[PDB]
Ligand binder design. Structure first.
Ligand SMILES: [Cl-]
Ligand SMILES: [Cl-]
Length: 307
């Protein structure tokens, strides 16, 4: 859903901008849950209606909201938390907020009760600004296919040059750390190590996916030697296995092993009880978007949140 929302939005942004310049321009498409929100300033009511047909021609779109005016910025996680104090971190994760012009749009899959609460909180934070709600209540196979490599591409990023992480070390690819020394030369040599050539501090995607496989294998061995992680891992299907490998990549073997109660529920296949519980940890607090995708993967056993 992450990849389809973005994929469609850009195709609509780009095919729409093309049509406008054939009659500088202002068009913006935002995608949430395959529902699409059209933003910008067009000159005539007929063009606004034509840009809306472009979007509705997207077979994978299950809704289109045309809010183009006839002559922006998405809220970041912290700014939403400043505004939704009192709502659980889990419910805040099912909400996108955008301000385009002098309007503020609120998208999300909410209970009728949750809608009135969040609508209230947003209206009091913006004051006398217009607030548009776009709520939903509680074949198509041409898109990219999701796998574990594309999963951790969305959750960490793909870097094809040696970059410094946050801890002051050197890294490349998908979080594949090279060395904790501040010596770049030390990192460039270790980069040649795993690739076996004159990388020159640069790699291709084909040979970054080769690293990512080495990193995945390394995790799966730590997992099978850890007394708490092994039985859970063995009992789970393929997608749910990549959810677990995701958490290990993020917190290390020992970190994940501390989720005692949530692990017992996964090994017991209680998918929904395991989700309510994982959404109560510091993990959800400090990386809610990721933890929302990882946790839905655990609940559905599918690539929904990522597709
Ligand atoms: Cl933030
Ligand atoms: Cl996050």
């Amino acid at each position: 859903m992450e990849t389809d929302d973005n994929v469609m939005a850009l195709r609509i942004e780009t095919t729409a901008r093309s049509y406008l310049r054939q009659n500088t321009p202002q068009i913006s498409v935002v995608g949430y849950n395959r529902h699409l929100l059209l933003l910008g300033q067009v000159a005539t009511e007929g063009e606004k209606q034509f840009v809306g047909q472009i979007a509705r021609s997207e077979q994978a779109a299950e809704g289109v909201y045309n809010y183009i005016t006839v002559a922006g910025d998405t809220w970041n996680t912290s700014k939403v938390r400043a505004t939704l104090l009192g709502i659980s971190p889990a419910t805040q994760a099912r909400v996108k907020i955008i301000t385009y012009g002098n309007v503020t749009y609120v998208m999300g899959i909410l209970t009728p009760e949750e809608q009135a609460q969040i609508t209230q909180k947003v209206s009091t934070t913006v004051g006398v600004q217009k607030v548009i709600t776009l709520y939903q209540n509680y074949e198509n196979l041409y898109f990219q296919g999701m796998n574990i490599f594309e999963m951790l591409r969305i959750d960490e990023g793909l870097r094809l040059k040696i970059y410094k992480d946050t801890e002051g070390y050197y890294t490349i690819g998908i979080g594949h750390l090279l060395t904790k020394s501040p010596s770049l030369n030390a990192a460039k040599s270790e980069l040649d190590k795993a690739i076996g050539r004159n990388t020159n501090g640069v790699i291709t995607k084909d040979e970054a996916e080769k690293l990512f496989n080495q990193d995945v294998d390394a995790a799966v061995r730590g997992i099978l030697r850890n007394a708490k992680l092994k039985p859970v891992y063995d009992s789970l299907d393929a997608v749910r296995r990549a959810a677990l490998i995701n958490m290990v990549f993020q917190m290390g073997e020992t970190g994940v092993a501390g989720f005692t109660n949530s692990l017992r529920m996964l090994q017991q296949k209680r998918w929904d009880e395991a989700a309510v519980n994982l959404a109560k940890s510091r993990w959800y607090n400090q990386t809610p978007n990721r933890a929302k995708r990882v946790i839905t993967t655990f609940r559905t056993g599918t690539w929904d949140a990522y597709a």
